Amino acid sequence: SKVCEISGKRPIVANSIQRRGKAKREGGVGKKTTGISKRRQYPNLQKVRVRVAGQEITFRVAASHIPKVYELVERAKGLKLEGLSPKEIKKELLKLL
Amino acid sequence: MKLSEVRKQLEEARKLSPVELEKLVREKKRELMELRFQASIGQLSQNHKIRDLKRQIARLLTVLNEKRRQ
Amino acid sequence: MRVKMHVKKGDTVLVASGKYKGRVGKVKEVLPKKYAVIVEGVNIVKKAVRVSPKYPQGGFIEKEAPLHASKVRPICPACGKPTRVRKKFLENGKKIRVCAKCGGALD
Amino acid sequence: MKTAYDVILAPVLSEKAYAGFAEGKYTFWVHPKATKTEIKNAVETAFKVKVVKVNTLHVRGKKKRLGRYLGKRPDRKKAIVQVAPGQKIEALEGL
RNA sequence: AGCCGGUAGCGGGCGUGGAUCCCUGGAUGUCCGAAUGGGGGAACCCGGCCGGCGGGAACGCCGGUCACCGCGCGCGCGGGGGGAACCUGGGGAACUGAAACAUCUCAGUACCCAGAGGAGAGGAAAGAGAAAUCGACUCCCUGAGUAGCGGCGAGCGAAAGGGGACCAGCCUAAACCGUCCGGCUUGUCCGGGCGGGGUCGUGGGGCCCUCGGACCGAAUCCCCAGCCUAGCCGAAGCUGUUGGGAAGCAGCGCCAGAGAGGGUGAAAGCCCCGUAGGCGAAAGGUGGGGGGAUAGGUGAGGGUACCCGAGUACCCCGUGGUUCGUGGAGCCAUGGGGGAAUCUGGGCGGACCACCGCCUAAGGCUAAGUACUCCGGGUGACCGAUAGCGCACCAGUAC
RNA sequence: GAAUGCCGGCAUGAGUAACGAUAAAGAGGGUGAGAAUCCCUCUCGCCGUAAGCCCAAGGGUUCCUACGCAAUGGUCGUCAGCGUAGGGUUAGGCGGGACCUAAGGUGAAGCCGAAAGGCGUAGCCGAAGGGCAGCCGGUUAAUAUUCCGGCCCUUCCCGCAG
RNA sequence: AAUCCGCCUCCCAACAAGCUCUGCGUGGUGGGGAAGCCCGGGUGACAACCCCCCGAAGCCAGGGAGCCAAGAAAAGCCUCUAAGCACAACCUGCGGGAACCCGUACCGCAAACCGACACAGGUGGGCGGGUGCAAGAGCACUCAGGCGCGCGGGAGAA
């Protein structure tokens, strides 16, 4: 329920629209709206744990960009990464975005 | 303090060293305390001298500051 | 920035208006913040003074009351006539007041 | 620059302060920020004595008015310094 | 040529050897405050380290320094907080109106929040939309209360085009080349950095052949004009008379690129301050105008089909935006699922299909015309102390 | 000319109700322009698990002295918690800080949330709890475990000896 | 890590002692010191300063017993050891030096605090003497101390 660290996908506000009646295309009188109220659509955030330069790195990422984490790991092979902390490894991977 | 005395005080102050300017400020600050004491017992009819000394001291510290900025 | 004064202490001025109009006298003092001058022997008033160290016996003194600076006009020391003042740039070149009727210096 | 003469402002002029001269206790107005230790040193290098005891108290300014304008006198600080046996501060012996 | 603020006085001083005062720069600038050594009930309290002072080791004082986060190889640079409105983004009501009320309205308003700057946003067509057309964006007029939207109720309400203001266009990613670094799965490798190259819709670029060898020029830097932050010169009236007083009345004059206005004892072109017309910066600020640098900018065929921005386009589901409230509902945006291609690629012209055309998405920047008024000035068929700002006065005070 | 309109002024009620505990007063002397009301003396009455004394909050010079009485004081006022001025608060040992932790607050690590922000073991802050060395007397118009006197004590630094 | 603490075993000591700490008394020494009289001070006075009794809810204290509802933390302190360092360091005695910041006036059951007021209201802790009433902080009187409540004078109806 927050922000994708890879895509920047973020919760958005959407309306919930309750309708009644038969649609005109089916020969009905038409749809009537018995209620419109705000709600939120969340990104499909999940955890992606991954080992890079011998250290466990955790990403909070929308499912749509799960493969983008592994791409960042692949491209990480060309980086002077060993000896660094997880916080510092993470910053490097994200910089390759 | 007349203008001529102020010009002259500045010329002579700008020839002293920082160490000399400090000793002189210290001397004038004891002079200023003595004026204060005489003022508080109503024995200083020439009260303008208190303002004069304080601005003398300010001028000296201003020159002390000149010499130490570069 | 500064109150403009066409007259100073102490040149010779004519008092050209008021009860003392026509009088000539020296400017004893100029009061820029009141835009007023004090002319010797002009605008005399009786002031009450209390019995005091300063004034034993008490009674009254005589004081010169200020005159609006526009009521007064300098007497040119060259031609001896009441004059508006002009400005002249010398060769220094400082600026001086000069008489408008002839051209003499007033200072 | 800070000197002994910035710490010691004036003597305290009162019957209670004068009562102290007879036993070597001299009372000054000192800078409100001044510490007992620095008042000790200030008195010693100004009056050429040895201080063996310092007492201090803050003196709050008196609220005063002039017509419709209520105000305050400045806050002050008093120091009573005890000088070594047999010593004196002739400037205050005054009287 | 006077001066030591409002502020007189007491008591003393200063100034043509140029004071007070006004402008610019500098110095000093206790403590609190983003407050940042640490703590804290703001303006207090308590420390580490280096140096100094005292007889000084205990104690205290003086100077320097010590928060956190971001970025870049312990050190540097940056950030933090504030600002009357104006601006953009992230969120986002209700009364009310519909003479009840729920969709709808009020309104993406009020307000909360983040951010920006003297503006901000937007901006160089995957545009418009029917002109065989136009040619970034912004802003004004108009188109037009039109087209439309709408419990087709109440109401809501475009765009194109035309007239104007201003004017300006650029940098990248990828192919390919070079170089450095490291990865382990040893090289014709893959990855990372840097440099070159390249930037477009008459499609453009790369590579390969063939042909050909100075003019433009910044939005960046430099100089200068001009401007601001003090100022200066500036024409011409005397006499009598009534009056406390002349500027009124009278006599005789004069100036005017100045007869705007305000003062002066009453009603003054010529007494004063000004006005018309002119003049002025060592210093700081500005400089969009002028000049100069620099950055950058630049051919034609033919072949090759190497590149042309991906969890993207595209389709479906849930919504938002638009005049569009599910409507025949396209377009632009996107939370979920599925998921391409590189010009013979792709998006659009209001379902959809064909035809015919328009355009080049998934990287970034970009003056000016526009908004506002804390601040300075100018001007009112604006107020004149119950008015005009809440405050003409020691008011965001007393209370 | 009216809006129980708004602001201000001034009336009526009216010399009326009231003057705030039914613990209570009387006289003499003094001061002074002025005295039921201030000072002094005698007498009387009231409180006395308080209506006396000490401390903490809160208040902030109201404390002491001199000079005052326009207003403040429910009358009066020469008086005063009122006006003007001068003076007055002194600590190694009392209280708090340079010590400790409580709830709670804050918060390296970490977790969460459109933004603002919400949480969070350690740590830190947080007292009227823990801890820690001063008793009695004298002195001032006004301070006193603070000044002084007597007799004691704590910590820190340095040094000596063990 | 530990020689400390915990656990097991043995010996002695153990309701004794020992060591230690606090209270109270005494204690070199320093103070105080009434009525009355006289003008807060002098005198009383070279003051005296002793005996008996009552006696706390306070002190010794971290005391004892009973009970169930089962009754803070951390530092100071002591002990153990680690890096270290063992010419140092710490401990004990003694000596000299050093010892900062803030509060302290005054009101404080009230005329100075909260109630618009010098307001019969509200405001936490300690001391709160004597006699009698069975006791007591109750009640009456009264000590020290503090007051008569900031309008009065008459009259003697409803």
Ligand SMILES: [Mg+2]
């Ligand atoms: Mg729904």
Ligand SMILES: [Mg+2]
């Ligand atoms: Mg339908």
Ligand SMILES: [Mg+2]
């Ligand atoms: Mg049909």
Ligand SMILES: [Mg+2]
């Ligand atoms: Mg419908």
Ligand SMILES: [Mg+2]
């Ligand atoms: Mg999850």
Ligand SMILES: [Mg+2]
């Ligand atoms: Mg997973």
Ligand SMILES: [Mg+2]
């Ligand atoms: Mg998806």
Ligand SMILES: [Mg+2]
């Ligand atoms: Mg998917």
Ligand SMILES: [Mg+2]
């Ligand atoms: Mg000067």
Ligand SMILES: [Mg+2]
């Ligand atoms: Mg001038």
Ligand SMILES: [Mg+2]
């Ligand atoms: Mg005249």
Ligand SMILES: [Mg+2]
């Ligand atoms: Mg005449």
Ligand SMILES: [Mg+2]
């Ligand atoms: Mg000049």
Ligand SMILES: [Mg+2]
């Ligand atoms: Mg300084």
Ligand SMILES: [Mg+2]
């Ligand atoms: Mg005395």
Ligand SMILES: [Mg+2]
């Ligand atoms: Mg010192």
